[PDB]
A paper describes a structure:
Cytolysin is produced by many clinical isolates of Enterococcus faecalis and consists of two post-translationally modified peptides termed cytolysin L and S. Cytolysin is a member of the lanthipeptides, a family of polycyclic peptides that are made in a two-step process involving dehydration of Ser and Thr residues to dehydroamino acids and subsequent addition of thiols of Cys residues to the dehydroamino acids. This process, catalyzed by the enzyme CylM for cytolysin, generates the characteristic thioether crosslinks called lanthionine (Lan) and methyllanthionine (MeLan). We describe here the 2.2 Å resolution structure of CylM and demonstrate that its dehydration domain surprisingly has structural similarity with eukaryotic lipid kinases despite the absence of notable sequence homology.
Author numbering: 3 to 161, 178 to 400, 455 to 772, 787 to 861, 871 to 885, 897 to 992
The structure:
């Protein structure tokens, strides 16, 4: 069975050498149809670059006994370094059974364990650097590795436990029998064995050589290692693992056998402490070329509440620092709370770049990049909790201090651009950092699957299980060859990067050139160079949202606007003030616009509400999405000008047409929300095209319900004469019950929207019957709702909100109406409201809407696009009343 250890390439080679090439073909078909997530392109990639061709692969897949020249294949296997090493381990073993530990289930590996023990004894007799306890610990670690590796195989190799171990593993040949039964388990076992011996020997030689520096740096009096522990299953670069080492005086260091730049990082942190008052805890290290030793950092108790505030401020600072220098993979679980200091113990992932995954080329995926450029990607934003009187102190009621910590770092750094940029260029151009290009858990899962008895019975089978790695959407898949090589080798893949280059350094030191397009160094220089108040502001929002302390109105509530200052504008100068205000609104919108020059698309990042407030990208819903901004530019075009706004309205149409949206039958949410604004675009400007698109969509309680969609359907009939729509809505309205979906008393979220439909479906009087059987201020609930469907001074009063949905612009629609029905009573009150809104606009340089500084809601119903729209309607009533869709 030994020939089953052969890999596809190895099988392919021997067959060619056997004077053979015509492979069965039938088993290629048997392989080609198996459950796989590999797409055709993936398969094409793998077949060509891992194997020469599809023929070779077909040849390399030949099963067991169908194999010619078995002896010459066996001789090939027996010539392999790992096979020879397996022989030596078997032949070296000794009959005695009285020295090595009896805490068992490790019976199967006693051969490996003894061989490891004698190797370690011989080594220490030379080095004199550890004790017998330490060697005991080392063997437990090897034992646990072999246990874990072979366990899945054990459970099925059955088909009280000591009986099977006694039986199945009793003699030399009987152990050879189990390993020849699973010859891929045998190969990897010996591979892991060799790694274990080499890494331990290498470790012990390093500690012996580095000892005077270790003693001096860490104030350790002892000259002998006594204990090794905490060896996480996370191994890299030929079985290398982090370990905690305890000396015979009880003092501990952490051994990290990793490529590193710890000396540059220390000088960097010191710079940051001086320049940015970063107050980073500097962890003591003895740094060497391809490894380092680190100070053992424990979770020491914090003394008082005054220190807890300091702790969480410092935490906010670390977040600011992580943002500024593109830190990823930090993980807030893993911070060590060292008294009043949060301590990072892994800092190998500064200066990162986005993984070159495949994404579309729209403005709306480019908009996704700004999240990947935020505080959220650092790993630091929710042994890591401070502890006071055996009590864990979470961030609850300390959120404020984290926010302040972060803000102060970002503000100070903004003022220190040139010093930061000069440091980086002076000291860090060749920084080597790690890149996690695929999450560890994915790699871990893959490895476990590859440990299936079926993978261990036939290398070919293990190889195929790993073939799945080729499914991942890397732009450059040349990297997967290296992941595969770590994983068959039994390791988690690991990659490094010099921050000024665009290549990846693979686990064996090989380069993958042109992996990145821009260097990590430049990405950070620019972020630093470009750092502005707007960025600080959005990072504060992200954070406050994450800490669950975001207030959508905090920003407007905290403005000081005085009492008796500024007054009512005259008819003529009020028109001049409206246009200026709409230009201010447009410009606020454009400044936050994300353009993609390539596809002529645009999108925005904005704070939006969906049960909670979250930062998001604008999608196709009327309430707070892209149709909102669309209709506003439409209206602004109706006046003037063509230029500027043409090359933006196209971009907006491109996005709305071509993004993940619904087919839903609704006038809010999904492509069905695009109807009205397209009709309005048709009715105000020429554009048949918007009407063309408008009709295409149509073929497929007011908010959230159907009421609104019924209403726009009627608009369609009207503009196209085609009564297929009026009947469409009739059907829906006939089954639509009389009770409102919500108990509120308004339009959109109450009974008044239903009312309006009846007086559109001709059937008045019976509309008045509901108006009869019942007998704040907003359009959505409240009286402006009631007003527009059909105590005036209450409903027309100024409020400290400006939006359409439940603010002054909605009130302004009520006034626009009343002042048409009765100019003498209302034309002045109307101009009063407009003037108050414009005056506060001017003074505050913002409108009274949800959001934060530099980040006003952009939406139609709660944002500034609707306010601009309403203001424009006042200038020309040809702009229809969107509030009830006309
Ligand atoms: N300098 C250190 N002090 C204390 N514990 C550490 C240190 N470095 C690593 N560890 C621990 O060892 C494990 C991490 O190894 P690594 O992921 O390579 O940093 C975690 O469980 C840490 O708690
Ligand atoms: Zn509302």
């Amino acid at each position: 069975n030994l020939i089953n250890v052969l890999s596809i390439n190895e099988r392919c080679f021997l067959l060619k050498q056997s004077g053979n090439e015509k492979y069965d073909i039938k088993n290629l078909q048997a392989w080609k149809e198996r459950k796989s997530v590999l797409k055709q392109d993936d398969l094409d990639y793998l077949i060509k670059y891992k194997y020469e061709s599809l023929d070779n692969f077909g040849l390399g897949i030949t099963p067991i006994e169908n194999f010619p020249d078995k002896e010459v294949a066996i001789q090939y296997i027996k010539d392999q370094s790992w096979y020879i090493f397996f022989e030596s381990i078997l032949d070296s073993y000794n009959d005695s059974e009285e020295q090595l530990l009896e805490v068992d289930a490790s019976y199967p590996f006693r051969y490996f364990l003894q061989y490891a023990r004698l190797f370690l004894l011989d080594l220490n007799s030379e080095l004199n650097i550890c004790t017998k306890e330490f060697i005991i610990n080392l063997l437990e670690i090897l034992t646990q590795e072999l246990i874990h590796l072979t366990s899945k195989t054990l459970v099925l190799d059955l088909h009280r436990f000591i009986y099977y171990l006694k039986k199945r593993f009793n003699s030399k040949k009987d152990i050879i029998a189990f390993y020849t039964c699973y010859p891929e388990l045998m190969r990897i076992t010996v591979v892991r064995m060799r790694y274990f011996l080499d890494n331990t020997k290498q470790m012990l030689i390093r500690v012996t050589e580095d000892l005077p520096s270790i003693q001096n740096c860490f104030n350790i009096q002892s000259s002998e290692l006594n204990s090794i522990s905490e060896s996480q299953g996370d191994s890299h670069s030929r079985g290398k693992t982090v370990s905690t080492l305890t000396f015979s005086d009880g003092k501990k260091i952490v051994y990290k056998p990793k490529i590193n730049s710890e000396n540059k990082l220390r000088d960097f942190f010191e710079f940051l402490n001086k320049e940015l008052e970063a107050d980073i805890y500097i962890v003591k290290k003895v740094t060497r070329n391809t490894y380092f030793y680190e100070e053992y950092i424990d979770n020491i108790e914090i003394n008082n509440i005054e220190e807890v505030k300091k702790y969480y401020e410092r935490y906010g600072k670390l977040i600011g620092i992580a943002f500024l220098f593109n830190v990823t993979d930090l993980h807030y679980e893993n911070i060590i709370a060292h008294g009043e200091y949060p301590v990072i113990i892994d800092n190998e992932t500064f200066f990162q770049q986005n993984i070159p995954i495949e994404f579309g080329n729209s403005a709306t995926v480019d908009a996704k990049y700004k999240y990947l450029d935020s505080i959220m990607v650092t790993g630091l934003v929710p042994k890591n909790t401070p502890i006071m009187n055996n009590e864990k102190i979470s961030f609850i009621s300390y959120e404020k201090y984290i926010v302040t910590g972060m803000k102060s770092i970002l503000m100070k750094a903004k003022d220190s651009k040139k010093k930061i940029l000069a440091y980086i260029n002076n000291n860090l151009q060749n920084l080597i950092v790690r890149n996690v290009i695929r999450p560890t858990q994915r790699y871990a899962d893959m490895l476990e699957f590859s440990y299936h008895p079926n993978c261990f019975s036939n290398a070919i089978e293990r190889e195929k299980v790993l073939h799945n790695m080729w499914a991942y959407p890397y732009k450059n898949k040349k990297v997967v060859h290296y992941e595969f090589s770590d994983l068959i080798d039994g390791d988690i893949p690991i990659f490094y990067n010099n921050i000024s280059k665009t290549s990846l350094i693979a686990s064996d030191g090989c380069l993958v050139e042109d992996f990145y397009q821009e260097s990590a160094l430049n990405r950070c220089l620019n972020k630093i160079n470009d750092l502005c108040d707007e960025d600080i502001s959005i990072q504060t929002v992200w954070l406050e949202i994450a800490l669950n302390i975001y207030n959508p109105y905090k920003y407007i509530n905290d403005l000081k606007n005085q009492n008796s200052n500024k007054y009512i504008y005259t008819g003529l100068e009020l028109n001049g003030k409206i246009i200026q205000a709409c230009q201010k609104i447009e410009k606020k919108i454009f400044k936050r616009a994300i353009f993609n020059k390539k596809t002529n698309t645009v999108n925005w990042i904005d704070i939006k509400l969906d049960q909670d407030w979250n930062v998001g990208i604008l999608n196709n819903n009327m309430y707070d999405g892209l149709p909102g901004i669309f209709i506003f530019y439409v209206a602004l075009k109706y006046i003037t000008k063509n230029h500027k706004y043409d090359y933006v309205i196209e971009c907006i149409k491109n996005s709305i047409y071509t993004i993940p949206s619904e087919d839903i039958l609704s006038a809010f949410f999904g492509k069905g929300s695009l109807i009205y604004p397209l009709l309005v675009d048709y009715r105000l400007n020429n554009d048949i095209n918007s009407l063309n698109v408008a009709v295409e969509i149509a073929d497929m309680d007011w908010i959230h319900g159907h009421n609104s969609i019924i209403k726009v359907l009627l608009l369609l009939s009207e503009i196209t004469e085609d009564e297929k729509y009026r009947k469409f809505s009739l059907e829906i309205f006939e089954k639509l019950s009389e009770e409102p979906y919500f108990n509120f008393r308004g339009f959109g979220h109450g009974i008044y929207s239903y009312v309006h439909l009846l007086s559109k479906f001709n059937r008045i009087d019976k509309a008045n019957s509901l108006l009869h059987k019942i007998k704040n201020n907003s359009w959505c609930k409240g009286t402006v709702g009631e007003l527009l469907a059909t105590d005036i001074n209450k409903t027309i009063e100024y409020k400290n909100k400006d939006c359409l949905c439940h603010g002054n612009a909605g009130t302004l629609e009520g006034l626009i109406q009343l002042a048409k029905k009765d100019p003498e009573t209302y034309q002045y009150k109307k101009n009063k409201l407009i003037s108050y809104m414009l005056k506060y606009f001017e003074k505050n340089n913002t409108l009274k809407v949800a959001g934060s500084e530099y980040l006003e809601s952009l939406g139609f119903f709660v944002g500034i696009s609707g306010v601009g729209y309403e203001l424009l309607r006042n200038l020309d009533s040809e702009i229809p009343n969107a509030l009830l869709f006309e």
